[PDB]
Amino acid sequence: VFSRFVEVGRVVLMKTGPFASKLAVIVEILDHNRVLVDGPQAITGVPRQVVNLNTISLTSFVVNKVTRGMTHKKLCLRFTQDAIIKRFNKTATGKAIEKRILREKMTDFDKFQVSIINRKINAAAKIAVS
Amino acid sequence: KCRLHVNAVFMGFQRAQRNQYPNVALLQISGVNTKEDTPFYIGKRVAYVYKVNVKKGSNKPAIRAIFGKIVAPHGNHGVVKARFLHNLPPKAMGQNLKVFLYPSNI
Amino acid sequence: STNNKVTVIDCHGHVLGRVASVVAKHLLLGQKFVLVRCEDLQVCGTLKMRLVQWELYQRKRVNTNPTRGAFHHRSPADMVRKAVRGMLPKNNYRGKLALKNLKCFEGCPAPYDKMKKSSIPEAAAIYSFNPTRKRTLLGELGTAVGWKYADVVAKNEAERKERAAKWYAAKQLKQKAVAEAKEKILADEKYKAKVAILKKFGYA
Amino acid sequence: MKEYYITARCTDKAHNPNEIFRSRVFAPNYVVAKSKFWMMLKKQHKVKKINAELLQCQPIFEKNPTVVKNYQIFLRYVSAGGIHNITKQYRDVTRVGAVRQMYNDLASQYRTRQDKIQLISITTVGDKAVKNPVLHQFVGHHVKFPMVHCKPVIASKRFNLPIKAGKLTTKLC
Amino acid sequence: SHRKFEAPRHGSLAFHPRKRVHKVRATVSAFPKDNAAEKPHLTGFLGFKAGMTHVIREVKRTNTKLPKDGVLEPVTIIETPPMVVAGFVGYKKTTTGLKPITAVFAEHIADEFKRRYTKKWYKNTKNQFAVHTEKYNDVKAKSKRERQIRLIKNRCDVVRVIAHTQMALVPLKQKKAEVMEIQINGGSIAEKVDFAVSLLEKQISVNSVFGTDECIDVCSVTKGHGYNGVIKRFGVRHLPRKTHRGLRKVA
Amino acid sequence: PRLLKKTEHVVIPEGVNIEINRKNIKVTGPRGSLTREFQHPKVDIYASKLVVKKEGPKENVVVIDMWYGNRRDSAVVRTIASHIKNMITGVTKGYQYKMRVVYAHFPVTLVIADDGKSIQVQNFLGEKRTRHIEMYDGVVVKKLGKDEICLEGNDVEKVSQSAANIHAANLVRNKDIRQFLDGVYVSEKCLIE
RNA sequence: AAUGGCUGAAAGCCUCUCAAGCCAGAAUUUCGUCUAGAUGAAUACUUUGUCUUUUUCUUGUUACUUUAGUACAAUUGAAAAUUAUAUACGUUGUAUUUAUUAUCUCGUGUAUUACUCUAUCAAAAGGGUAGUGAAUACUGAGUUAACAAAUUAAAGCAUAA
RNA sequence: UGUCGGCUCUUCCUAUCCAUUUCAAGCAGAAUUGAAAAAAGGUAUGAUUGUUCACCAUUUAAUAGGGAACGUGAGCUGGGU
RNA sequence: AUAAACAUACUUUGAAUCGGCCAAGUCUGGUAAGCAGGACUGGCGAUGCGGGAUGAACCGAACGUCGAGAUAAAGUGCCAAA
């Protein structure tokens, strides 16, 4: 059996476009190739729009009690009720998103410290093993 | 000692199906995969450093270079156009060139 | 500088034509390629479908002298080389030099069996093909047309798989021990100054 | 595809100049939209450009381009045999969006170019009035399907390397 | 237009091109397919054609109309003095055919075998296998031999014994031996090498290789004729007597 | 048209244990084992508990599922379900194919090996050539009465093909098959238990 | 292959399949066998062990002779399989070229290595054991830097095969 | 650009005459007839005519139809034109 | 209405030429022809260049020697620039 389904309420992550690496929630399924994502614009900043399924990725979370054509006011309440933001940041995808944001503002001097420090730690660990 | 350049491949000359214009050389910079990353390299320096096996009786250097500048993007795949002081020899097609970090704008 | 290292392509689960097109372009860009397992490539069509195409290929032959005529190589490594050679310039030094930097093998020979293997995403068979479309391994087609050494390769690959099985098992043991040793250094108090820098940038 | 609201009047002996013609025309721009309008007048009312005055040509924008609606289009197209009337249904959020789907779908299923199709009318039908064999399945409340065999997505063209490292994999996604 | 009347082509296309060989001895292109469920045995030999004669043989086939007093048949005589086994070689199956891995030779080698490695024996120093024989019993060289035996037992599939004739036993004026590789068909490679090692320096008689009333295959170089015309080479129809410029050619 | 979801299910009886590993079903019953590979790249085979009766309870089933897929592909869902249903039937109440020998003038004598893995048809239409017909593994021949045999086995595809191999080896050639009604024919196919 | 069939859906039944999966079936195809055959491999002997160019002796080849130049042991490069992938996670988002903190010296032992070398057992192994050195971590302290500098060319024939 | 036919020789097409494998018949057997896979192998001897063509007498498993500058003259012949 | 002063009107002397061929939202004879003959226009002949792999006529466009750009017909998996 499959684990993650494209449905109404399924939390998805945008992988391309102006809103890359931003969470979103499916509220309507137009057809087999298009969904209507309304990842609450007041929370994650993704406007209500129609996207192709080749631009998103399914997550492991589903917002409960989300019906098709859910409005922004009601959808925002259920998004915080299930605490998707906290749950997403605990998963492997979330940590990789924070890591990417961490490394982009990480200058030449910072590269020097980490590269020098990591080499010593990795060498030290290799010595420890008998 | 240290690497202060990015290897670029001399793909060929700006051409058509049955024509060729050796004034503009086409380069593929390593790490540039699209035309939106080209603006950083527009105006940088490019050198074609080649080795010549001179004799003991000649004072001509064994290492020579031809310098140029990256002037414009070419297509949507991060290919660039470079103009050199002397047009690159077509025998150097497929070889590696140096893309320097200067003239800097940072 | 000079590209002295060799790009090794694992031809397993790839398409013969789309691998050749990407390899042919980069051969002209001065790179050096070695395509291993050139017998495990896939082509569109069933075995009967491919045999009809092969027999048409076999027809082309100089009538007055078949020794002068087209040579129909049956080894899959020579089926890949023909496909690559068709996408390279003909009758000039640029074309011959580019083909000089290409080698196919039916398995992983001694020097290239411990090298970093690469892949060509455009040529992957899981992207360009409908899963229901029937395919044919180049090794299976080669046997049907007279490639004698298909079972010699199957023997050599089997011993490589088992040899790589014990090396990987030993490496996974050492890596786990090294991983846990690093955790103790990370949790160690004397390395507190160095750990915080790694944690600040997310490395730790 | 854009929708326009065009009006005009006829000033001559045949037609009294107190009757105004309206239409809603789908066209890539207003210049093409006017041309469709004039041919409708000429082929249905004997009205010609040299004896008529255009009054208004304004775009019609979708009022709520965030609501999914089942659009029904009544069209007539010309085949090798003759002329037929078709009624196709599409699910989109904009009227101009549904017409864009209809032109593409007709050019593939029937190999009919755009200059053989006349859009008689486009309306909105109910949820259960969709009769398209495939589209009927996605109109329910509890539609659910696992998109399998996903090709991994690329953030942008920047990371589109020609040759990759290691093995490749799809995503159960 | 079509040829008026049909006839088979003259000459076989299976023997094209007609190129004359360079060596008198003919090498067998194949050996009988190996079976691993029998004792090791040699699968070939080498002999010199002496001539031909005729025999009267008694017919033993039943349900035949042949005379009961015998049938006159020709027989070719092949003199086959015993061979001397002077080494063996192991072959490995690769993706380009058999590849000889190593060759192990005996301690004592006859001058008939040595003559193969020169082209002017009377001017040569005849130092063939001198270092091999002189250092045969050294501790270092002996250890190398054991590795060669163990390498074959590990990474080889075909074992052949290098046997050479004794030309002093035949009326031929030639003194250089004739060398032939005879494949060993039989048990596993473990017991194949053991059999080959036992045969080193020994003599193999033809009775051990072939049985009685056994059908064999023979490979040899035919009798030379030189430059020959179309009539003799292929067998085309001689042209009519009226023909200008000659009769014995293809029109 | 393309079907959003086409599904089928097979009810597992008590004395049957099924384990699945990448579209490779192994079924074990009181009569033995049966392994088959279903190499279709668009079916999801997995075992679950489902209510298949109108008002019945939950029961262990094997669900063969294929999602969005045209009518050419969708036909394979019930094909695989029938194969698994047959496999369950074979290991519980094995199959048997009762073949009968039909002759007009020349009697046909059947010689079956001691263990039952081979047969031998003799004097078929007076022919001197004797047919052998080997049997597949897991299929055993035996003689029921006069001019009647039966092939026992656990896999229907093995039993059915072996039965057809017997018939296909005794075909009349170059003669009117409407008049020379000879050979071995399958009278009926039934279950042992 | 044409054709006859098995199981079997689509289409609750039927059906050899313009479905998945199999079997039997030609003077057919491919191995096997026969002839010619390219790059090759093993062994024997003569050598050489960083390397060639240009001359030059020989019927020709290799070794060889002379004048010079060049490098000098030590971190390179491997899971396999599948993709409707047991579960879970989706581990996101730059393959090669291209990942070493300038140089030298001074200091303590331990530890590590697809590191070099030696001896041995093996072995068509990123092999085992022992020793040695190298680099690195524990982990230092000092010196110095400014202008200059940081891929083989020419000549011979004594001897040996 | 040497213009018919024959002789010699090679290759190619299948719209197949025989041999091989199949299906159908108003196929009981024998002899047949229609069709499919298949062009790897065979497909003749003479009287009359320059003849291609034709007509007879045989034999054969069959004595199929065609192309290659209406194949082929520094290959022959010169019967015809 | 639009255009027109290197506009307009010419005069004298004279060269070569009157074997033509192609295309078609055209026609006649012919079963038809890369056949024979016509109405209108554009071309080839007299004409290179870019594209159609190759081509007298097709599509873009007509040429002093060059540099830099935007283009046309038409293309963008490799040969082949995209």
mmCIF file of N, CA, C and O (backbone and C1' of nucleotides) in Angstrom, chain E residues 1-11 13 235-240 242-245 249-251, chain H residues 5-11 42-45 52-53 65-68 70-72 74-78:
data_model
loop_
_atom_site.group_PDB
_atom_site.id
_atom_site.type_symbol
_atom_site.label_atom_id
_atom_site.label_comp_id
_atom_site.label_asym_id
_atom_site.label_seq_id
_atom_site.Cartn_x
_atom_site.Cartn_y
_atom_site.Cartn_z
ATOM 1 N N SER E 1 18.908 -9.764 -68.292
ATOM 2 C CA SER E 1 17.843 -10.752 -68.325
ATOM 3 C C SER E 1 18.228 -11.991 -67.541
ATOM 4 O O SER E 1 19.383 -12.163 -67.166
ATOM 5 N N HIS E 2 17.252 -12.854 -67.288
ATOM 6 C CA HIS E 2 17.529 -14.093 -66.583
ATOM 7 C C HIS E 2 18.407 -15.002 -67.430
ATOM 8 O O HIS E 2 18.362 -14.973 -68.661
ATOM 9 N N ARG E 3 19.231 -15.799 -66.760
ATOM 10 C CA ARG E 3 19.956 -16.847 -67.459
ATOM 11 C C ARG E 3 18.959 -17.841 -68.033
ATOM 12 O O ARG E 3 17.934 -18.136 -67.418
ATOM 13 N N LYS E 4 19.246 -18.340 -69.233
ATOM 14 C CA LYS E 4 18.263 -19.166 -69.923
ATOM 15 C C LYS E 4 18.007 -20.464 -69.168
ATOM 16 O O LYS E 4 16.855 -20.870 -68.983
ATOM 17 N N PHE E 5 19.068 -21.121 -68.707
ATOM 18 C CA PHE E 5 18.948 -22.383 -67.995
ATOM 19 C C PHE E 5 19.745 -22.323 -66.705
ATOM 20 O O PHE E 5 20.816 -21.714 -66.654
ATOM 21 N N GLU E 6 19.230 -22.975 -65.673
ATOM 22 C CA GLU E 6 19.817 -22.897 -64.347
ATOM 23 C C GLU E 6 20.769 -24.061 -64.109
ATOM 24 O O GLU E 6 20.571 -25.166 -64.615
ATOM 25 N N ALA E 7 21.816 -23.793 -63.332
ATOM 26 C CA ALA E 7 22.799 -24.807 -62.977
ATOM 27 C C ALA E 7 23.486 -24.377 -61.694
ATOM 28 O O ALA E 7 23.594 -23.176 -61.430
ATOM 29 N N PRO E 8 23.951 -25.321 -60.876
ATOM 30 C CA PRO E 8 24.650 -24.946 -59.644
ATOM 31 C C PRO E 8 25.936 -24.196 -59.944
ATOM 32 O O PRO E 8 26.569 -24.395 -60.982
ATOM 33 N N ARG E 9 26.319 -23.318 -59.023
ATOM 34 C CA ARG E 9 27.566 -22.589 -59.181
ATOM 35 C C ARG E 9 28.752 -23.530 -59.025
ATOM 36 O O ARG E 9 28.690 -24.528 -58.304
ATOM 37 N N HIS E 10 29.837 -23.210 -59.720
ATOM 38 C CA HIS E 10 31.042 -24.028 -59.694
ATOM 39 C C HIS E 10 31.967 -23.526 -58.595
ATOM 40 O O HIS E 10 32.354 -22.356 -58.592
ATOM 41 N N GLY E 11 32.325 -24.409 -57.682
ATOM 42 C CA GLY E 11 33.153 -24.010 -56.560
ATOM 43 C C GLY E 11 32.326 -23.633 -55.350
ATOM 44 O O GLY E 11 31.186 -23.190 -55.449
ATOM 45 N N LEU E 13 31.714 -21.402 -51.911
ATOM 46 C CA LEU E 13 31.998 -20.123 -51.282
ATOM 47 C C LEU E 13 32.402 -20.268 -49.825
ATOM 48 O O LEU E 13 32.711 -19.262 -49.180
ATOM 49 N N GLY E 235 36.067 -25.667 -62.130
ATOM 50 C CA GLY E 235 35.363 -26.675 -62.894
ATOM 51 C C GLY E 235 34.319 -26.102 -63.826
ATOM 52 O O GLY E 235 33.219 -26.644 -63.943
ATOM 53 N N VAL E 236 34.653 -25.004 -64.495
ATOM 54 C CA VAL E 236 33.745 -24.360 -65.433
ATOM 55 C C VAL E 236 33.762 -25.126 -66.746
ATOM 56 O O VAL E 236 34.648 -25.953 -66.979
ATOM 57 N N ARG E 237 32.783 -24.865 -67.606
ATOM 58 C CA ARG E 237 32.676 -25.564 -68.879
ATOM 59 C C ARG E 237 33.689 -25.015 -69.871
ATOM 60 O O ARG E 237 33.799 -23.801 -70.046
ATOM 61 N N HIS E 238 34.427 -25.910 -70.519
ATOM 62 C CA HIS E 238 35.377 -25.485 -71.534
ATOM 63 C C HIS E 238 34.642 -24.906 -72.734
ATOM 64 O O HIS E 238 33.604 -25.420 -73.156
ATOM 65 N N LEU E 239 35.178 -23.819 -73.275
ATOM 66 C CA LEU E 239 34.513 -23.100 -74.344
ATOM 67 C C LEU E 239 34.605 -23.876 -75.655
ATOM 68 O O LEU E 239 35.446 -24.764 -75.804
ATOM 69 N N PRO E 240 33.735 -23.571 -76.618
ATOM 70 C CA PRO E 240 33.764 -24.287 -77.897
ATOM 71 C C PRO E 240 35.085 -24.103 -78.626
ATOM 72 O O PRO E 240 35.837 -23.158 -78.383
ATOM 73 N N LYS E 242 35.745 -23.197 -81.563
ATOM 74 C CA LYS E 242 35.825 -22.049 -82.455
ATOM 75 C C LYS E 242 36.341 -20.790 -81.772
ATOM 76 O O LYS E 242 36.615 -19.806 -82.464
ATOM 77 N N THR E 243 36.479 -20.797 -80.449
ATOM 78 C CA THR E 243 36.669 -19.564 -79.698
ATOM 79 C C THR E 243 38.011 -18.910 -79.996
ATOM 80 O O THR E 243 39.057 -19.563 -79.979
ATOM 81 N N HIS E 244 37.968 -17.610 -80.269
ATOM 82 C CA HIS E 244 39.167 -16.795 -80.373
ATOM 83 C C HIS E 244 39.740 -16.529 -78.988
ATOM 84 O O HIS E 244 39.009 -16.406 -78.003
ATOM 85 N N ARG E 245 41.067 -16.462 -78.917
ATOM 86 C CA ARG E 245 41.862 -16.075 -77.753
ATOM 87 C C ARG E 245 41.954 -17.153 -76.676
ATOM 88 O O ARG E 245 42.665 -16.937 -75.692
ATOM 89 N N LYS E 249 38.600 -20.787 -70.103
ATOM 90 C CA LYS E 249 38.361 -19.608 -69.282
ATOM 91 C C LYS E 249 36.866 -19.343 -69.211
ATOM 92 O O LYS E 249 36.079 -19.900 -69.976
ATOM 93 N N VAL E 250 36.483 -18.493 -68.264
ATOM 94 C CA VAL E 250 35.091 -18.086 -68.113
ATOM 95 C C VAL E 250 34.800 -16.962 -69.094
ATOM 96 O O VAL E 250 35.518 -15.958 -69.136
ATOM 97 N N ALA E 251 33.746 -17.132 -69.891
ATOM 98 C CA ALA E 251 33.453 -16.171 -70.947
ATOM 99 C C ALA E 251 33.030 -14.821 -70.379
ATOM 100 O O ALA E 251 33.587 -13.782 -70.745
ATOM 101 P P G H 5 18.440 -10.363 -77.769
ATOM 102 O "O5'" G H 5 18.702 -11.819 -78.358
ATOM 103 C "C5'" G H 5 17.617 -12.664 -78.711
ATOM 104 C "C4'" G H 5 18.070 -13.868 -79.500
ATOM 105 C "C3'" G H 5 18.936 -14.869 -78.762
ATOM 106 O "O3'" G H 5 18.191 -15.725 -77.915
ATOM 107 C "C1'" G H 5 19.879 -14.439 -80.875
ATOM 108 P P G H 6 18.727 -16.071 -76.442
ATOM 109 O "O5'" G H 6 19.792 -17.224 -76.687
ATOM 110 C "C5'" G H 6 19.417 -18.422 -77.346
ATOM 111 C "C4'" G H 6 20.594 -19.092 -78.004
ATOM 112 C "C3'" G H 6 21.728 -19.506 -77.088
ATOM 113 O "O3'" G H 6 21.461 -20.718 -76.405
ATOM 114 C "C1'" G H 6 22.613 -18.408 -78.977
ATOM 115 P P C H 7 21.925 -20.915 -74.880
ATOM 116 O "O5'" C H 7 23.502 -21.068 -74.985
ATOM 117 C "C5'" C H 7 24.082 -22.131 -75.723
ATOM 118 C "C4'" C H 7 25.581 -22.008 -75.767
ATOM 119 C "C3'" C H 7 26.265 -21.831 -74.423
ATOM 120 O "O3'" C H 7 26.459 -23.058 -73.742
ATOM 121 C "C1'" C H 7 27.108 -20.244 -75.950
ATOM 122 P P U H 8 26.331 -23.123 -72.146
ATOM 123 O "O5'" U H 8 27.522 -22.210 -71.630
ATOM 124 C "C5'" U H 8 28.872 -22.632 -71.743
ATOM 125 C "C4'" U H 8 29.797 -21.643 -71.089
ATOM 126 C "C3'" U H 8 29.445 -21.277 -69.658
ATOM 127 O "O3'" U H 8 29.981 -22.202 -68.730
ATOM 128 C "C1'" U H 8 29.843 -19.311 -70.913
ATOM 129 P P C H 9 29.247 -22.489 -67.336
ATOM 130 O "O5'" C H 9 29.341 -21.103 -66.567
ATOM 131 C "C5'" C H 9 30.583 -20.630 -66.075
ATOM 132 C "C4'" C H 9 30.441 -19.266 -65.452
ATOM 133 C "C3'" C H 9 29.368 -19.132 -64.390
ATOM 134 O "O3'" C H 9 29.787 -19.612 -63.129
ATOM 135 C "C1'" C H 9 29.232 -17.311 -65.882
ATOM 136 P P U H 10 28.706 -19.953 -61.997
ATOM 137 O "O5'" U H 10 28.354 -18.539 -61.366
ATOM 138 C "C5'" U H 10 29.339 -17.815 -60.652
ATOM 139 C "C4'" U H 10 28.929 -16.385 -60.412
ATOM 140 C "C3'" U H 10 27.628 -16.167 -59.668
ATOM 141 O "O3'" U H 10 27.746 -16.368 -58.274
ATOM 142 C "C1'" U H 10 27.746 -14.690 -61.501
ATOM 143 P P U H 11 26.454 -16.765 -57.412
ATOM 144 O "O5'" U H 11 25.651 -15.401 -57.271
ATOM 145 C "C5'" U H 11 26.247 -14.272 -56.655
ATOM 146 C "C4'" U H 11 25.473 -13.015 -56.951
ATOM 147 C "C3'" U H 11 24.019 -13.019 -56.520
ATOM 148 O "O3'" U H 11 23.858 -12.730 -55.145
ATOM 149 C "C1'" U H 11 24.173 -12.229 -58.732
ATOM 150 P P G H 42 21.851 -25.152 -55.833
ATOM 151 O "O5'" G H 42 20.989 -26.409 -56.270
ATOM 152 C "C5'" G H 42 20.537 -26.534 -57.603
ATOM 153 C "C4'" G H 42 19.398 -27.508 -57.714
ATOM 154 C "C3'" G H 42 18.611 -27.420 -59.005
ATOM 155 O "O3'" G H 42 19.229 -28.113 -60.069
ATOM 156 C "C1'" G H 42 17.117 -27.423 -57.197
ATOM 157 P P U H 43 19.582 -27.324 -61.413
ATOM 158 O "O5'" U H 43 18.167 -27.135 -62.111
ATOM 159 C "C5'" U H 43 17.404 -28.268 -62.485
ATOM 160 C "C4'" U H 43 15.954 -27.928 -62.705
ATOM 161 C "C3'" U H 43 15.645 -26.925 -63.797
ATOM 162 O "O3'" U H 43 15.731 -27.464 -65.099
ATOM 163 C "C1'" U H 43 14.363 -26.423 -61.893
ATOM 164 P P A H 44 16.113 -26.515 -66.334
ATOM 165 O "O5'" A H 44 16.937 -27.467 -67.305
ATOM 166 C "C5'" A H 44 18.162 -28.041 -66.882
ATOM 167 C "C4'" A H 44 18.266 -29.496 -67.268
ATOM 168 C "C3'" A H 44 18.276 -29.807 -68.753
ATOM 169 O "O3'" A H 44 19.530 -29.590 -69.369
ATOM 170 C "C1'" A H 44 16.786 -31.262 -67.674
ATOM 171 P P U H 45 19.605 -29.328 -70.949
ATOM 172 O "O5'" U H 45 19.273 -30.744 -71.591
ATOM 173 C "C5'" U H 45 20.083 -31.878 -71.327
ATOM 174 C "C4'" U H 45 19.635 -33.066 -72.138
ATOM 175 C "C3'" U H 45 19.506 -32.821 -73.625
ATOM 176 O "O3'" U H 45 20.754 -32.893 -74.283
ATOM 177 C "C1'" U H 45 17.597 -33.969 -72.847
ATOM 178 P P U H 52 15.053 -19.356 -79.966
ATOM 179 O "O5'" U H 52 14.365 -18.137 -79.211
ATOM 180 C "C5'" U H 52 15.151 -17.182 -78.517
ATOM 181 C "C4'" U H 52 14.319 -16.032 -78.012
ATOM 182 C "C3'" U H 52 12.942 -16.383 -77.478
ATOM 183 O "O3'" U H 52 12.975 -16.886 -76.156
ATOM 184 C "C1'" U H 52 12.778 -14.511 -78.903
ATOM 185 P P C H 53 12.067 -18.146 -75.745
ATOM 186 O "O5'" C H 53 10.692 -17.906 -76.512
ATOM 187 C "C5'" C H 53 9.696 -17.051 -75.970
ATOM 188 C "C4'" C H 53 8.579 -16.802 -76.953
ATOM 189 C "C3'" C H 53 7.679 -17.986 -77.255
ATOM 190 O "O3'" C H 53 6.695 -18.208 -76.264
ATOM 191 C "C1'" C H 53 8.304 -16.959 -79.275
ATOM 192 P P G H 65 9.340 -20.776 -66.977
ATOM 193 O "O5'" G H 65 8.901 -19.301 -66.588
ATOM 194 C "C5'" G H 65 7.539 -18.918 -66.642
ATOM 195 C "C4'" G H 65 7.319 -17.591 -65.969
ATOM 196 C "C3'" G H 65 8.255 -16.475 -66.384
ATOM 197 O "O3'" G H 65 7.914 -15.894 -67.626
ATOM 198 C "C1'" G H 65 8.081 -16.503 -64.041
ATOM 199 P P G H 66 9.053 -15.199 -68.516
ATOM 200 O "O5'" G H 66 9.356 -13.849 -67.738
ATOM 201 C "C5'" G H 66 10.678 -13.357 -67.620
ATOM 202 C "C4'" G H 66 10.764 -12.286 -66.566
ATOM 203 C "C3'" G H 66 12.075 -11.529 -66.494
ATOM 204 O "O3'" G H 66 12.214 -10.524 -67.476
ATOM 205 C "C1'" G H 66 11.505 -12.227 -64.347
ATOM 206 P P G H 67 13.667 -10.215 -68.073
ATOM 207 O "O5'" G H 67 14.334 -9.295 -66.965
ATOM 208 C "C5'" G H 67 13.702 -8.101 -66.540
ATOM 209 C "C4'" G H 67 14.511 -7.400 -65.485
ATOM 210 C "C3'" G H 67 15.954 -7.108 -65.843
ATOM 211 O "O3'" G H 67 16.100 -5.949 -66.640
ATOM 212 C "C1'" G H 67 15.852 -8.040 -63.681
ATOM 213 P P A H 68 17.309 -5.835 -67.687
ATOM 214 O "O5'" A H 68 18.597 -5.656 -66.772
ATOM 215 C "C5'" A H 68 18.715 -4.560 -65.879
ATOM 216 C "C4'" A H 68 19.865 -4.758 -64.927
ATOM 217 C "C3'" A H 68 21.231 -4.888 -65.576
ATOM 218 O "O3'" A H 68 21.809 -3.628 -65.847
ATOM 219 C "C1'" A H 68 20.931 -6.624 -63.998
ATOM 220 P P C H 70 20.637 -3.523 -73.230
ATOM 221 O "O5'" C H 70 19.059 -3.521 -73.035
ATOM 222 C "C5'" C H 70 18.483 -3.926 -71.807
ATOM 223 C "C4'" C H 70 17.369 -4.916 -72.015
ATOM 224 C "C3'" C H 70 17.760 -6.247 -72.634
ATOM 225 O "O3'" C H 70 18.309 -7.147 -71.682
ATOM 226 C "C1'" C H 70 15.809 -5.410 -73.683
ATOM 227 P P G H 71 19.618 -8.017 -72.019
ATOM 228 O "O5'" G H 71 20.489 -7.944 -70.690
ATOM 229 C "C5'" G H 71 20.874 -6.698 -70.129
ATOM 230 C "C4'" G H 71 22.149 -6.819 -69.330
ATOM 231 C "C3'" G H 71 23.391 -7.198 -70.117
ATOM 232 O "O3'" G H 71 24.014 -6.066 -70.696
ATOM 233 C "C1'" G H 71 23.228 -8.548 -68.177
ATOM 234 P P U H 72 24.457 -6.071 -72.234
ATOM 235 O "O5'" U H 72 25.690 -7.072 -72.266
ATOM 236 C "C5'" U H 72 26.840 -6.829 -71.473
ATOM 237 C "C4'" U H 72 27.647 -8.084 -71.271
ATOM 238 C "C3'" U H 72 28.104 -8.797 -72.529
ATOM 239 O "O3'" U H 72 29.264 -8.215 -73.096
ATOM 240 C "C1'" U H 72 27.237 -10.366 -70.982
ATOM 241 P P A H 74 34.010 -6.530 -75.941
ATOM 242 O "O5'" A H 74 35.599 -6.663 -75.971
ATOM 243 C "C5'" A H 74 36.260 -6.986 -77.184
ATOM 244 C "C4'" A H 74 37.771 -6.957 -77.092
ATOM 245 C "C3'" A H 74 38.434 -7.493 -75.840
ATOM 246 O "O3'" A H 74 38.413 -8.902 -75.752
ATOM 247 C "C1'" A H 74 39.586 -5.576 -76.628
ATOM 248 P P G H 75 38.620 -9.613 -74.329
ATOM 249 O "O5'" G H 75 37.213 -9.441 -73.608
ATOM 250 C "C5'" G H 75 36.003 -9.772 -74.272
ATOM 251 C "C4'" G H 75 35.829 -11.264 -74.346
ATOM 252 C "C3'" G H 75 35.197 -11.819 -75.605
ATOM 253 O "O3'" G H 75 36.086 -11.856 -76.707
ATOM 254 C "C1'" G H 75 34.282 -12.893 -73.719
ATOM 255 P P C H 76 35.542 -11.555 -78.188
ATOM 256 O "O5'" C H 76 35.138 -12.985 -78.752
ATOM 257 C "C5'" C H 76 36.039 -14.079 -78.695
ATOM 258 C "C4'" C H 76 35.316 -15.387 -78.883
ATOM 259 C "C3'" C H 76 34.568 -15.539 -80.196
ATOM 260 O "O3'" C H 76 35.409 -16.011 -81.233
ATOM 261 C "C1'" C H 76 33.162 -16.158 -78.389
ATOM 262 P P U H 77 35.131 -15.624 -82.764
ATOM 263 O "O5'" U H 77 33.688 -16.222 -83.055
ATOM 264 C "C5'" U H 77 33.474 -17.621 -83.167
ATOM 265 C "C4'" U H 77 32.029 -17.909 -83.463
ATOM 266 C "C3'" U H 77 31.496 -17.245 -84.720
ATOM 267 O "O3'" U H 77 31.668 -18.085 -85.843
ATOM 268 C "C1'" U H 77 29.998 -16.912 -82.889
ATOM 269 P P G H 78 32.180 -17.489 -87.233
ATOM 270 O "O5'" G H 78 30.922 -16.685 -87.781
ATOM 271 C "C5'" G H 78 29.645 -17.310 -87.862
ATOM 272 C "C4'" G H 78 28.551 -16.332 -88.205
ATOM 273 C "C3'" G H 78 28.848 -15.408 -89.382
ATOM 274 O "O3'" G H 78 27.653 -15.220 -90.136
ATOM 275 C "C1'" G H 78 28.348 -14.119 -87.469
#
